[PDB]
Paper text:
Here we describe the structural and functional characterization of three AQP2 mutations associated with recessive NDI: T125M and T126M, situated close to a glycosylation site and A147T in the transmembrane region.
T125M and T126M are located in extracellular loop C, immediately downstream to an N-glycosylation site at Asn 123. In contrast, T126M and A147T both showed significant amounts (30% and 50% respectively) of a population that most likely corresponds to the monomeric states, as well as the presence of higher oligomers and aggregates. Density for the methionine side chain could be observed in all monomers for T126M however this was not the case for T125M due to the lower resolution.
Residue numbers in the entry:
A (entry chain B): 6 to 238
B (entry chain C): 6 to 241
C (entry chain D): 2 to 233
D (entry chain A): 2 to 240
């Protein structure tokens, strides 16, 4: 019961640092405007560092979509999945509120809210978010699959660069979500809920798609006791 | 029976995600035009992520040139190589068609077709694409070599940054192909086939050079007794 | 023992040489070169790959702290005698100012300029900045303590690259506020060479409080040692 | 003998092919200005990922020096015969000039220019420039010696990346002073092709001294090997 509290707190602290570092590096800084690779690096190295620092404590989800995909695949109780999602949403809004407090009001602006950029249709954008989170969920599962042992090699760096890979594409359409907590945090702080359903349906459908594709299509487990039914039939 | 189907599907899904993410990060230029390092990071981390995600399922080729290269030193049969190349070409055009659907019409443009750039001639260009794939195939063979001298596992990031390394050079000449499927996908969707042979002869010839250079010149692998007999009894 | 004595001397020398190379490469890549002004990602990569290279090169000799803050974090965290920590902090401050003095005499005088002294940027207040420096160093010691935790021996992991990209991560954000310190030696080095001590206490209070916060958070809240025989 | 063995011939050819690919990719990515001018981070990444990829591709075959300074560094440390060191340096110089001549052939004449020769930049003096090149190669040699240290546990691929990012680290600083050499073969290759030899001694004295300095510092001062079979057992001592 005490290790579960450490894990929920770690998920809270991790999403706090992720959103604080991520949005603050994505703000419109006048003299030095951030580039797409610069923002992708910020979010990328953010997940990779927090997975390194807190992966052994809680699994380092830092993402409700990852937690939901973990609910379909790995052995996580619906009790733990709810506590994780709740901890991530609370940590995210705390990191965005903290960033707002420390960032001068001149630079804050939209506080890096997710908005449909490059005149992307919501139906077009929700399809992008689907495949953005799909490749991340595929990489997270493969990097943390216990059946692979120590063979993955670079779990923290690979998951980070997978997040950066999605940002290198998703920034132009929606500013890249791949995380419902990363989208909700600046939307609550600064009043901006432009097409917010895209940043929830997209990642969640993309996450459950990658979990089902991996755990039961690409690399399913061996048949369990259910084979006794085919013998009886 | 099923494991081969899961591998071919992985090659299809991997090339689908690779082309979707790769070409998309090369278009999408409103007020923020992508730089050479930015585009190279997209293709680089794309291969590295998909080698990490699907390498243990299919081998993570995501390249008909790489699949052709593995025909000599990857224990891949001519049956599997054809199924892999077909899955790569189908996934590539599916990723380019999907990107076209989700990208607004004004931004699409060329859809990141491989094209001759900076007044580079097709003979000069096909020479670049050879060495772009030579170093990639050279890195893949060592990264998947049991005698490379490290703990078991495949370095997906090393393979990814090898793809990125080729882009920091190849973009200025051809937009960097290194992958015949990566070139056919936007060529089929858009219709632009200008000097399309450069993006096929280049990667395929560069791959067979790296495979022959590694497996016969640089680091010839250890032959099993059954493999050793196919040589001897095939002689005289 | 005689073998134990040199190993400590090898470690103190490595800490001096490491902070010397870190400050020399970091500041020199952050200078305002007119033909190619460095971008935030360019500067972040310079400091990031600098730590990662030096941790790769000297981690197995001294631990590759390269930061008085993380050395203090090991005092409260990875329990190390105050003797070794004092020798480490002194070597870092001496190597840093030596690296900044070397870069000064190595770079033409016109372009030396501010020598990448940590300074308040974008009208950020000292109270807001000292809060940023806290969380920049907080995540760094969180990554360092996990990458070097005695209990994670088995698989070697990627400590040098992870810590290096953790330093870069802090620069993606910290550059816009203070030019990113995360290291009191990296701040004292160019301030001593080129007299610029504007709000220097921020670059000392910030990293030290964030380091002790992350060391206390790791060793007592997140991943403490087993109190009893329940799991040892 | 060592000369008449296949592994030595395979190692010399690997050193030749590796330097050929490194110079071809490095200069060409640093020299292609027309409408897209390469950035310092871009050039640093090209040379960085270049060394990292070739160390990963050919390190197990020859050691992947790709640098007469690095070869000299192991001549002062890593058991490399003075016969092997001469064959390695000769293979690197031949592969470099072959890679530079190859790049000149495939790059259109409008963009070739000086072919990315190492040149003193931003009014840096030769004494100041030769001091940069020393410390650029020193940290690289320190990183190479540690990335190849059998006493250090690492995961696959990360040592090649660490060496690569060490090269990229030097370029993030060295480009502003000299265009970043850290390799006498990388400087001679375009100098022979294009014919520009301005202050060529800086790109030779600097990297070599920095390599010997780094090899001596690592093998004798920082992390020397054991002397007796009881050394490691003695380090334990009491509890």
């Amino acid at each position: 019961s005490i290790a579960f509290s450490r894990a929920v707190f770690a998920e809270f602290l991790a999403t706090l640092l992720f959103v604080f570092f991520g949005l603050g590096s994505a703000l419109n800084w006048p003299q030095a405007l951030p580039s797409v690779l610069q923002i992708a690096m910020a979010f990328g190295l953010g997940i990779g560092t927090l997975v390194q620092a807190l992966g052994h404590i809680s699994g380092a989800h830092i993402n409700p979509a990852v937690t939901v995909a973990c609910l379909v695949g790995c052995h996580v109780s619906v009790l733990r999945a709810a506590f994780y999602v709740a901890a991530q949403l609370l940590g995210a809004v705390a990191g965005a509120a903290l960033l707002h407090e420390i960032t001068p009001a001149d630079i804050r602006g939209d506080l890096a809210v997710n908005a449909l950029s490059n005149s992307t249709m919501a139906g077009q954008a929700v399809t992008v978010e689907l495949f953005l989170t799909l490749q991340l969920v595929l990489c997270i599962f493969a990097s943390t699959d216990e059946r692979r042992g120590e063979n993955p090699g670079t779990p923290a760096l690979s998951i980070g660069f997978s997040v950066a890979l999605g940002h290198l594409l998703g920034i132009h359409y929606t500013g890249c979500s791949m995380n419902p907590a990363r989208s909700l945090a600046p939307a609550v702080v600064t009043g901006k809920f432009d097409d917010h359903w895209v940043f929830w349906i997209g990642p969640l459908v993309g996450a459950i798609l990658g979990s089902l594709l991996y755990n039961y299509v690409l690399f399913p487990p061996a048949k369990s006791l259910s084979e006794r039914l085919a013998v009886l039939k």
